[PDB]
Design a protein around this ligand. Structure first.
Ligand SMILES: CC(C)(N)[C@H](NC(=O)c1ccc(C#CC#C[C@@H]2C[C@H]2CO)cc1)C(=O)NO
Ligand SMILES: COC(=O)[C@@H](N)C(C)(C)NC(=O)OC(C)(C)C
Ligand SMILES: [Zn+2]
Length: 267
């Protein structure tokens, strides 16, 4: 496909899930070859794995003392829409969580795409690879299309679930919200995270119950969301990705480990 930017500036704002602070974004059009980058306090932070500074409960980037938490959801939307050149100006410390999914970003950006004049140089997975960390595993192999499977093993009523995204099915993952388990939330808050979490932006689950009155958007909403997260983390390769991926219990740390290994192999 063609490289793409946005036709005009687009703004989003709201609380961040981990900081609990209110932040604002402005997405700026950029010319071919710019890439995806964030901008904060005069500093450009490329959306690339070299700038990752944190991977526990979110993927965060930093450069020159300027940090932005929770980049994975906006990056996933940009990856899915193949937006390749933009600057995400951040006023604040975190990307807004909005409803917990990619939906608001996706709907606004998709109606505001500007095609550009050269084609995308995709990051094409060249050979099989596997990364592992204590029972968790992610595998990648060559594919002409982006295909991403996540398999979860939940210690509540959900049990085992799996879900596969393929190109053309973006609408199946951009509404899946972030989630949390009631028995884990105290620790998450104790370690300085989750300050903005609520039933308005998070699917909160117990051993045998759902806290949100509206319930789940899909019976497998959590694994759809984990696929969505992985697609955002994969964009830290710096180009839209072609490959077939399978994650068993992976999270941001393992996702970024895979990205760094792929980048090293194909440098
Ligand atoms: C899903 C994944 C991959 N682990 C990660 N999400 C988080 O880590 C995360 C998201 C929300 C909360 C909360 C809250 C809350 C709350 C109020 C108390 C409940 C109302 O009764 C805590 C952790 C993610 O989506 N990364 O992208
Ligand atoms: C059992 O609780 C933990 O160990 C959390 N650190 C853990 C569950 C690994 N978070 C997680 O899923 O990874 C993400 C993707 C970084 C949010
Ligand atoms: Zn997420």
């Amino acid at each position: 496909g063609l490289e793409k930017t946005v036709k005009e500036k687009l703004s989003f704002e709201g609380v961040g899930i981990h900081t609990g602070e209110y932040s604002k974004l402005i997405i700026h059009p950029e010319k071919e070859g710019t890439g995806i980058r964030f901008f904060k306090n005069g500093v450009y932070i490329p959306a690339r794995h070299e700038f990752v500074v944190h991977t526990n409960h979110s993927t965060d980037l930093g450069f020159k003392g300027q940090r932005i938490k929770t980049v994975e959801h906006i990056l996933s939307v940009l990856h899915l829409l193949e937006i390749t050149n933009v600057t995400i100006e951040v006023i604040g410390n975190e990307i807004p969580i909005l409803d917990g999914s990619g939906w608001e970003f996706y709907e606004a950006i998709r109606k505001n795409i500007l095609n550009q004049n050269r084609e995308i140089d995709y990051f094409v997975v060249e050979e099989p690879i596997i990364v592992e960390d204590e029972g968790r595993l992610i595998k990648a192999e060559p594919s002409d299309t982006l295909e991403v499977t996540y398999e979860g093993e939940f210690k509540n009523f959900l049990g085992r679930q799996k879900f596969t995204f393929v190109e053309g099915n973006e609408e199946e993952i951009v509404l899946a919200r972030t989630f949390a388990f009631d028995w884990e939330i105290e620790h998450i808050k104790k370690v300085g995270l989750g300050k903005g979490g609520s039933l308005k932006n998070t699917l909160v689950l117990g051993k045998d119950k759902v806290y949100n009155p509206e319930g789940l958007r899909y019976e497998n909403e959590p694994v759809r969301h984990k696929v969505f997260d992985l697609i955002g983390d994969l964009y830290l390769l710096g180009s839209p990705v072609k490959g077939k991926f399978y994650s068993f219990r992976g999270g941001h740390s393992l996702n970024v480990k895979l990205v760094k290994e792929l980048a090293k192999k194909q440098k």
